[PDB]
Structure formats: structure tokens, C-alpha cells
Amino acid sequence: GPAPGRAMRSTTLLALLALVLLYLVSGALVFRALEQPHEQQAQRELGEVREKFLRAHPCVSDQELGLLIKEVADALGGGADPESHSAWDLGSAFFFSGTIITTIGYGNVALRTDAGRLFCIFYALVGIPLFGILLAGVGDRLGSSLRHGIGHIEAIFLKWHVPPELVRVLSAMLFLLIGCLLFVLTPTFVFCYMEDWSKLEAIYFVIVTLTTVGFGDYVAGADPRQDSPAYQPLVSFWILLGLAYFASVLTTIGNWL
Amino acid sequence: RSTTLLALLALVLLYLVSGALVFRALEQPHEQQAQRELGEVREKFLRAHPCVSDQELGLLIKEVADALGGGADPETQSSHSAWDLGSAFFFSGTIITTIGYGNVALRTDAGRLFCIFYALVGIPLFGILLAGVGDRLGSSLRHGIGHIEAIFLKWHVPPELVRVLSAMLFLLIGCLLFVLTPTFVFCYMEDWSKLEAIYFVIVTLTTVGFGDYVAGADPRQDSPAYQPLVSFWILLGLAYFASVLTTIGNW
Ligand SMILES: [K+]
Ligand SMILES: [K+]
Ligand SMILES: [K+]
Ligand SMILES: [K+]
Ligand SMILES: [K+]
Ligand SMILES: [K+]
């Protein structure tokens, strides 16, 4: 009814369209000044690296070095450690499978085979939607489990003569802030040391992860090697519950709108 | 229902295992193969030049690793900006669509902090327009078929089956304009293989966005339309492929 109806009005879209278009333009102008100074430090920057090895070592020709770069190119282009770290063992392959259905897709360990790409194609067409079924399912019992809990302490708020305005003015904020505590503030200060990131990196990782954006610029566990069996299912378990609570909030306020 | 959930949970969990098993078989050879062959080139170049120590080589192989990771082209030796307004505009399209290629990673803390607030706002905001377009796109499209549909209902074809016929044609002309045509273009303009043009589109459409393949990211192809017009298709491609998923949930 309202979902197509509010969009059925052509003026609502085209105004929102130009809004989004210029919302993208504004973000591009900001993103430019924030990052343009420091990105392409590789294309021409390696050019000085070659000479600083042609100068540093007269014993090596440029063509010998040119082949060396081309040799290590196909080496790095398939899996090479600049120094066990197998990125396709069942542990990490399970992680890679999860990034597909969650639509996170870090791509930090991309597919090489034309057989693996085809397998992933059908794996995504079927795997992704049925994952959302379970995620929306968990959110049903998860949201109810909080409200069971939300209700118990709610009794105390109303008794202390804070008006029926309490809801809807309070029980929404405390409901989200406890989730903001458990699935954002708690993991960040954990990940701030568990991966030894800075303050913003832990927060930046969580958001891009939970928003299913998944740049792949930040997993850093393995930062060098996965190391511990703690993180492996638990973080995916955190992502799962992170998405579930994320789903609960977007759905509940969907009703309130 | 807790009965369907916990049962589906084991179904989903094993679906990941079954996927991880086959993924291992199709990738563990190729990745670990190069890991062994890298040690060869380390030896092979330590042989050719005893003048160069391994530590001085260890720095270099990491420098070229830092370079190649940055997308440094090993082809010739020595402008096409990445954070130019045209591609930075496309970069914003990666977050709000939750595609997030990550091919051009961020670096500045100010850029990441601004991206934090920009992502939280833009993503549900985009979904409103996307679904909004998908409603109007589906409506304007459904408006067009009716002309042809009126002719089809004369050949004594049962209206019960006329229902099913259009349902096929709905997705067929839909994928034709948003799967076949994009892949045939990507297989041509990017000269990717058939399994790379399809692979790019699908991973992009489902917003998985591995970033390994990105159309228009190729610095050379300077056809004036290609850079943002693909993203224009991405919008319509997202809206259509998502609107079907809603009707999929119904049927
Ligand atoms: K996504
Ligand atoms: K990515
Ligand atoms: K990379
Ligand atoms: K989505
Ligand atoms: K993604
Ligand atoms: K991604």
C-alpha cells in the first residue's frame, strides 16, 4: 500500500532523485579533498624504486629487474607473502563463504579459477536470499528477548511517575544504546587491542562490516595470520548477531514510520 | 517460530560448510602453488646477483608488493586520477549501494570519519530512491507490455495461462536489458571473458562487491559515457533485481 504508494507519486521520486544525485555530488567533493593527496603512491612511485636499485646495484641490468618485477607480479597475483598463511583452508574458506551471503564480500582473497567463479555465482544466487530468511528469523526472537528484558525494567520507569510519554520517547533509545553498547562500543574497544588498531579503525571496520559495504581494506585478522581460533567463528558470530540486531532496528522503526 | 529457525540455522550453517569444501578444492591448488614458486624466484635472483643481499632483496619484494597492491602497472616503466571527481563520485556509489569494491582503499582518518557518517545516512536514503525507482520502473514497464498483451489475448490463449506467459517475459526482457546486454558490453569494452562479465555483474548486483573486477576502472577506455553511465545502469540494475526479490518472497 504505502511502500509503492509513497513512491507512486512521481514528484516524490524526482525530487528525492535530484536530492540523492546532489547528495552524491557533495560527498564526492568532500571525498576528493580528503584523499586526493595520497592514493597513487604506487604507479610512478615504483619508478623511483627501480632506479634506486639500478643505482644501488650496477650488477643488475634493467631488463633483469624488469623481468624480476614481472616474475613476482604473477607470484603476488596468485598468493605471495612479503616476509602457513593459507587463504583457502576450510577455516578461511568458511569465512570467505560467509562474506558472500552477508553481501559483505571483502574480496581481500579474490577468486583465481574460472571454476571457482562459476561456483560462487550460483552459490550467491541461492545462498544470499536464504541467509536473509534466517537473519530476519533470528531478529524476531532476538527483538522479543530484549523486550522481555526491556519490559522488566520498564515497570520501574513508569512507577517513578515518568509519564506515558516515556514511550514513545525513551524505550527506543535505551533499546538501541544497549545494542550500540554490545555490538559497537564493546567490540571496538575489544578490536582496538585484539588487532591493535587505532581508535577510529575499530569503529570504521565495524560500520563498513555491518553496513555490508565490506571494502576489504580492513579485516586485519589475519593482519598477518589468523593466529587464534577465538576470532574465527566468533567474529562471524558477531557479524551475524550484528546484522540481526541491525535488522531488528531497521524493521521496528519501519513500523513506527 | 523457533522450530523453523533452529532447523534453518543448521541448514544455513551446513550450506556454508558445503560451500567452503568446494571453494577449497577450486582455489587451494592455485594459491599455494605460487607460494612455493615465489621461493624459487627468491633463489633464482639470489644466484644471478651475489652482489645483492637477501635483506636488500627482501625490502624490494615488499616494495613491489606495496606497489602492486596499489595497482602499480608492471607493464612499462616510469595521468588518470583515482580521486578525481568523476571516480570519487563512483566511490560514493559503492558505499550507499553497500557494494563497496574496496579497489581504491581509503587512507586518511578524516576521509574514514566522514565516510562513517556518510555511509550511515546514504545507505537507507539510497534504498528509498532505489525502491522508489523500482516501483516506478516496474510501473512504467508494466504500462508498456499492455499494448502487446492486448494483442496476445486474441489467439484464444487462456487468460489463466496469459498470466504465466507474461511472468516469463517479465524476467526475460528484464534480464536481457540488465544481465545479457551488460555482460555482452563488459565482455567487449573490457574484453573480459564471458565468465568475467557475468561474474562482475552478479557480484556487483548482489552488492557483494569483491572489487577484483570493476568496469570503467580501466584507465585507458576513455569513452565519455562509460564512467558514470555504468553506475546509472547499476542503479536501474539494482532496483530491478531487488524488486524481483520482493515478488520472489511473495511467490
Ligand atoms: K552489501
Ligand atoms: K571488497
Ligand atoms: K589487494
Ligand atoms: K541489500
Ligand atoms: K559489499
Ligand atoms: K564489498
- The CATH number of whichever domain residue B29 belongs to comes to 1.10.287.70
Work out the burial of residue B163: count CB atoms within 10 Å of its CB; fewer than 13 is exposed, 13-18 middle, 19 or more buried.
Answer: exposed
Mutate to test the interface with B, among A19, A83, A120, A240 (most CBs of B within 10 A): A120
The residue of chain A nearest to residue B58, with distances taken between CA atoms, is A83
Which of A24, A213, A250 lies at the smallest CB-CB distance from B89?
A24
Torsion sign, CA atoms B13, B14, B18, B21: positive
Tell me which residue of B121, B219, B69 sits closest to A107, measured CA to CA: B69
CB B61 within 8 A of CB B89: no
Work out the burial of residue A131: count CB atoms within 10 Å of its CB; fewer than 13 is exposed, 13-18 middle, 19 or more buried.
Answer: buried
Number of domains chain A contains: 1
Set of cell numbers at residue A237? 558470530
Q: How far apart are CA B56 and CA B213, in angstroms?
A: 34
Residues of B in contact with A247 (CB under 8 A): none
CA distance B28 to chain A (A): 5
Residue with cell 536470499: A129
Alpha helices (runs of H) in chain B, residue ranges in sequence order: 2-25, 28-48, 54-69, 85-96, 109-152, 159-175, 181-189, 194-205, 226-250
Which of A25, A80, A118 lies at the smallest CB-CB distance from B34?
A80
Q: How far apart are CA B102 and CA A200, in angstroms?
A: 18
User: Residue B47 belongs to what domain range?
Assistant: 1-251
Q: What would the DSSP string read from start to end of B208-242?
A: ---SSS-TT-SSS---TTHHHHHHHHHHHHHHHHH
> How many residues are there in chain B?
251
Residue with cell 541491525: A246
Torsion sign, CA atoms A78, B12, B123, B224: positive
